[PDB]
């Protein structure tokens, strides 16, 4: 059924007069630009460590696959064989305070 809840509520139309004021200072926006600079650097670095870890563990797993090929001729057919128990696979996200 094509019903979606991305339609904006009708109540957000009339009383839009609480904050018409948007005024900052030059030092504040200089800090904003410096923060955007350093965060682009920082999360680019974060993705750099992410891609380094994934390339390291990909090359570890493909080296693992070629070693299992060269040391076991009857185990690679069942090693690449997938497991059917991942159909109802779920994982809850992290929390703050343990029970």
């Amino acid at each position: 059924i094509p019903i979606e809840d991305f339609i904006t509520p009708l109540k957000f139309l009339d009383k839009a007069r609480e904050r018409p004021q948007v005024e900052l200072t030059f030092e504040e926006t200089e800090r904003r630009a410096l923060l955007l600079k350093k965060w682009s650097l920082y999360k680019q670095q974060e993705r750099k460590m992410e891609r380094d870890t994934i390339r390291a563990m990909l090359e570890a797993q493909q080296e693992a696959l070629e070693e299992l090929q060269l040391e076991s001729p009857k185990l690679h057919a069942e090693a690449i064989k997938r497991d059917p128990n991942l159909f109802p696979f779920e994982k809850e996200g992290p929390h703050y305070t343990p029970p």
Partner: peptide, 13 residues
């Protein structure tokens, strides 16, 4: 616990 697949991760001889 829970596994992901039959694919390995690291072999050492």
């Amino acid at each position: 616990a829970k596994f992901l697949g039959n694919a390995p991760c690291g072999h050492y001889t």
